[PDB]
Structures are given as structure tokens and as C-alpha cells.
Ligand SMILES: CC(C)=CCC/C(C)=C/CSP(=O)(O)OP(=O)(O)O
């Protein structure tokens with residue numbers, strides 16, 4: 001539909017506007033069109049995300065894609081929207097659907113860079129463990145090499161994975177997190193072992209509230225690149241930063257972000273990311289939501 005595509009792109013520029021970021025129709029429209037059948041309000045999930053620090057000059061957009069529409073990476077390559085990297089990452093989405101039950105897909109893009117990643121979601125009542133994932137042939141060797149570490153902190157069930165084709169990186173979105181895993185003592189030992197930035201009292205309180213935790217891995221080394229804790233809420237003042245600059249900008253985005261589901265309050269998902277040298281914050285404001293998110297808010301918010 002022309003209306004859906006134009007409606008989503010309209011909301012996108014608006015969201016980008018709040019952040020003072022410029023959009024590139026050339027790299028956005030061809031993508032939205034290819035997946036126009038998914039933009040139908042109802043069982044669609046659309047997110048517009050911002051990030052602090054050195055990552056504050058970009059706007060990412062995530063869009064769900066039902067499995068019925070077919071492998072989305074196969075789609076973007078075939079239509080000439082993205083080139084095969086000639087790297088194992090080219091086979092991972094496909095190999096994942098081959099070895100595990102994939103219940104849904106999603107793609108991610110940037111308003112100025114275009115397509116950059118896909119997601120493979122697994123059934124909430126049949127998620128794979130680290131063991132099952134590391135078995136996929138094109139999966140980074142780093143996952144198996146980190147199996148013991150993950151196990152030591154209770155990181156077991158994975159609700160979904162993502163593949164970043166430009167950075168050749170994979171995210172493991174761990175779910176059903178035990179209270180222990182998210183307690184300060186556990187979080188600190190984990191970061192310490194992964195050699196990441198140590199969070200303070202504010203950061204740790206935020207981690208304790210997390211519904212999802214995700215490490216980023218690569219094919220070059222067994223060293224985890226970064227670790228992110230995600231929080232879902234309607235509260236627009238949850239950014240885990242003490243910098244008046246962030247506290248301001250994020251609250252702004254959080255209360256002025258465009259969303260279609262008028263009648264309810266914006267669904268927000270905050271993120272605290274820890275890399276070896278720093279810590280930065282992220283915020284996704286859902287434009288489209290489904291009951292999945294409605295349920296998460298009752299369980300964690
Ligand atoms: C349900 C849907 C639409 C998918 C979730 C989108 C999602 C998990 C994206 C956030 S990822 P992100 O915080 O930007 O992390 P990186 O790719 O930078 O590692």
C-alpha cells in the first residue's frame with residue numbers, strides 16, 4: 001500500500017527530526033516498499049531508535065517481517081538492496097532457519113545508511129540454548145567458546161538473534177533472566193570477566209530491571225565486543241545516565257516520539273551498553289506494537 005509506506009516514512013522523518021538527524025529517502029523508501037505488506041497495523045512492530053554519545057547522530061529503524069514473507073536477507077540481496085559480503089554472515093540467517101524453529105523475522109536499517117541487519121525470532125515456549133546455537137555452521141566460533149561463561153551467569157535461553165551484515169557481528173538476546181543473573185554481584189562479575197566498563201549504582205539498578213540482556217560477538221575473535229541490558233517501560237525518565245545532557249535529550253525523545261497506537265502510552269525500551277572502553281545509552285520508541293509488547297509491559301513494568 002502507498003498509504004502505509006508513506007505513513008511509516010512520515011513518522012520516521014518526524015522521529016529523526018526530534019534528534020535533528022537527516023533522512024535519506026534513497027536508502028529508506030526502496031526498503032520500506034519491498035516490505036510494504038508488513039507495515040499493516042496489527043501484527044506489525046516498528047521501532048525508531050536513538051543512542052547517546054558517539055552514536056547520537058543516527059537513527060535506526062527496526063521492522064518485523066513474518067516468516068510467510070520469506071527470508072528477508074534473501075530478499076534484500078535478490079532485489080539489489082544489499083550486496084552479499086562473501087562472509088559466513090551471508091549464510092547465518094538461512095542456516096538458523098535450517099537448524100531451529102524460527103517464528104518471525106525482522107530487519108534493521110539506518111535513516112542514512114539503509115539496510116544493515118536481520119533478526120531471527122524463536123518461539124517463546126521453545127527457545128534454543130547456547131548449545132543448540134553454537135552448532136549452526138555459520139555461527140561465530142566465539143559463541144561456543146563463550147558457552148561456559150554464559151552458563152556461569154545463567155545466560156541460557158535465547159529469544160532471538162540478530163546479524164549485522166556491515167559490521168559482521170551477531171547479538172544473542174538472552175531471555176527468561178533469573179533474578180540472580182541481574183543482581184549487582186552477578187552483573188559485576190560478568191562485566192569484569194568480559195573486561196567491560198564497570199557500571200555504577202545507577203547503572204546496576206537499571207540492569208536489575210532488565211527483561212533482556214545481549215552480548216555482541218564477531219567471527220574474528222572470541223572476545224565479546226559489548227554487552228547490552230534492555231528495559232521495557234512507559235516511564236520516559238529511565239535513561240541510566242547522570243549527564244544532564246542525556247537526561248534531557250532522552251526524556252524529550254521519549255515523550256515526543258511518534259506512535260500509531262494512540263490511546264495507550266508509548267512503549268519504550270531503554271538500553272545500557274557496556275563496551276571495553278565506555279558505556280552508552282539507547283532508546284527505542286515503538287511506532288507500532290503488538291500484544292507481545294503489551295504483555296512485556298505487564299510482566300516487567
Ligand atoms: C521486535 C523487533 C521489531 C525487534 C527488536 C529490535 C532490536 C532488538 C534492536 C535493538 S538493537 P541495538 O540496541 O541497536 O543493538 P546493536 O544492533 O547495536 O548491537
Ligand SMILES: Oc1ccc2c(O)cccc2c1
Nearest residue numbers: 047049173212213230269284
Ligand atoms: O529496542 C528493543 C526492542 C525490543 C527488544 C526485545 O524484544 C528484546 C531485547 C531487546 C529489545 C530491544
Ligand SMILES: [Mg+2]
Nearest residue numbers: 049060061108
Ligand atoms: Mg540499532
